[PDB]
Structure 1
């Protein structure tokens, strides 16, 4: 089977990896990468890589992205060996600081040059962190786009749209982690289960390779109108920079029980074509899971904007 690895780069990246291991997630290998040895010693990841020990002496990059870049380059062979064998690599990082901003594009490039399908999932900083953080982050975002196959960007300011005045900050951060966690889970399930209309990792590659911005979403629903509601959920995250409008390629999977109807499959497909507003390259699949009764799940991967 294809092997999927998730790499957290810098403090936010390593936080996401820890929170996803906590949630449980298997068939996925985790790798934590950082300059900061204090933070890295707390990582729950099976594979830990301290970069730039010489440059930083176990500290972080002190918000200098050039030091994160030089720290990754210096540790290229330890990064290659941790990646080796991966068919797909998800590189997650908070843009704007020193280590994620500088090192995450180098990790991505190493992954892509070793043959993995390479997906970045990165955050931009909150506005309240100031203009410079934001400018450094935008330079990181540009570097990541040049190095990955597909990029998903999560503006942290979007978390302010889904909290109330009391929502704990750690709960907000878990919501942003879901973008990555559901993407990865979605792909993992699409590879593992055999569908009636079967999708596989060759279809993932066709839709995601060398294709810029991406959306990855899962939607689940029941009852009346379940296929439309699940498909609208899959494509409508309030956390994303890139909405599905304009998508040129789509991978879409519908999973349901024995009651799944042809009519409802068509309805869900049309939701995604309409929101696309394009002459799309759609690869459609279907799985019948008899353990499902009233539930239907729609998975969507959209690219090509």
Structure 2
């Protein structure tokens, strides 16, 4: 009697739906996508299999005009349609940009419904750029607080961090793809975790233990080869140029290491030690290992960190 967890990614509002579209385009098998929006013009362009227009009575098919109360009411009045789209999910990722009306107000409602539908619920949300002004920032902050109350775990990406990773000419869309990778690689790492029986096996119950009712989280992946591969991959997995919540202070970690037949005991300890030393806490680890003999010299380290 084997379990295969159902993973769903739900985009709420404009930025959430664009993250969903870009993830579908990148190719994401075994994951189901849901697009929720007030804005019918955008929703018509969604690539998601399941689309939910919310608030048509309130907005006549427009967005929420920067009013989070409208996003909140829209979501509440579509509760049954949202439940029906979620039903059967074991894990739901809710992604949205905070600061506008639809994401700010509707994403916390979506997350609350998912947790009520029984799903392990993870939010991955942005804060606005400082150039969008103090009022947008204050509205987003209220959204982040409401998300935190509604989810099991929350990953916040301040959009100002994108300014740290661009040069003067990096296209805006390229920058946005960098933020999208936080969610996409997190989801893919859980998917890969569930699909394979590891030599030291982790499964969805381990994901639930590390993520349920925890608050802030980090989810990261690193890949390296050659000398010092395990240390390099571990450092990449915990590196957080875009993240509000770094690895520092983590008290619980799920770490999975995947390598080929050459994967050494010593280098697995080295990777585990990198993570614990960066947390600078006594970390409760849940450690796994997968041998994929297709891999020659590459090692992959996946981390989920909570307990902040």
Distance 1:176 1:262 in 2: 34
User: SS in structure 1 opposite 2:218?
Assistant: strand
**Counterpart pick for 2:84 among 81, 86, 89:** 81
**Counterpart pick for 1:193 among 185, 196, 203:** 196
- Report the equivalent of 2:176: 173
Distance 1:249 1:84 in 2: 29
* Shift in Å, 1:279: 1.6
Deviations 1:97-150 (A, max 9, x none): 000000000000000011100000000000000001000000000000000000
1:288 aligns with 2:291: yes
* Shift in Å, 1:226: 0.1
Deviations 1:212-263 (A, max 9, x none): 0000000000000000000000001200000011111100000000000000
Distance 1:160 1:278 in 2: 30
* Shift in Å, 1:36: 0.2
User: SS in structure 2 opposite 1:146?
Assistant: helix
Deviations 1:58-83 (A, max 9, x none): 00000000000000000000000000
* Shift in Å, 1:281: 1.4
Distance 1:191 1:180 in 2: 17
Distance 1:103 1:169 in 2: 26
User: SS in structure 2 opposite 1:195?
Assistant: coil
Deviations 1:180-200 (A, max 9, x none): 000000000000011000000
User: SS in structure 1 opposite 2:231?
Assistant: helix
Q: TM-score under structure 1 normalisation?
A: 1.00
- Give the CA RMSD over aligned residues: 0.4
**Counterpart pick for 1:45 among 41, 45, 48:** 48
User: SS in structure 2 opposite 1:82?
Assistant: helix
Deviations 1:153-205 (A, max 9, x none): 00000000000000000000000000000000000000001100000000000
Q: TM-score under structure 2 normalisation?
A: 0.99
Structure 1: gaps of 5 or more residues: none
User: SS in structure 1 opposite 2:61?
Assistant: coil
Structure 2: gaps of 5 or more residues: none
Distance 1:247 1:237 in 2: 13
* Shift in Å, 1:278: 1.2
User: SS in structure 1 opposite 2:69?
Assistant: helix
Distance 2:170 2:249 in 1: 34
**Counterpart pick for 1:297 among 296, 300, 305:** 300
Distance 2:101 2:231 in 1: 43
User: SS in structure 2 opposite 1:63?
Assistant: coil
**Counterpart pick for 1:21 among 21, 24, 28:** 24
* Shift in Å, 1:25: 0.5
- Report the equivalent of 2:166: 163
User: SS in structure 2 opposite 1:48?
Assistant: strand
Distance 1:63 1:249 in 2: 37
Structure 1 runs (4+) greater than 6 angstroms displaced: none
User: SS in structure 2 opposite 1:254?
Assistant: strand
* Shift in Å, 1:17: 0.0
